[PDB]
Design a protein around this ligand. Structure first.
Ligand SMILES: [Zn+2]
Ligand SMILES: [Zn+2]
Ligand SMILES: [Zn+2]
Ligand SMILES: [Zn+2]
Length: 86
């Protein structure tokens, strides 16, 4: 649910270890897909390293329902809580 999405988005900030880059990109891309929906921005230039990585993670999800992105986000946070602790 949207309320559980809000809770997961809070809990992910309090993991005992910072998530890996792969995990951070999963979390970012699914967050954008669950909120904005399909990507609606142009890709950053080649030297915007963080920006283009973020954009790619969201772009890969094009066509995914907001409800599925939200479910995946929540499930990922639960996985991270078990992996790192909170
Ligand atoms: Zn739901
Ligand atoms: Zn890194
Ligand atoms: Zn920043
Ligand atoms: Zn996904």
């Amino acid at each position: 649910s949207q309320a559980e999405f809000e809770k997961a988005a809070e809990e992910v900030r309090h993991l005992k270890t910072k998530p890996s880059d792969e995990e951070m990109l999963f979390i970012y891309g699914h967050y954008k897909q669950a909120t904005v929906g399909d990507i609606n921005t142009e890709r950053p230039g080649m030297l915007d390293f963080t920006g283009k990585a973020k954009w790619d993670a969201w772009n890969e999800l094009k066509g995914t329902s907001k409800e599925d992105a939200m479910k995946a986000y929540i499930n990922k946070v639960e996985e991270l809580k078990k992996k790192y602790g909170i």
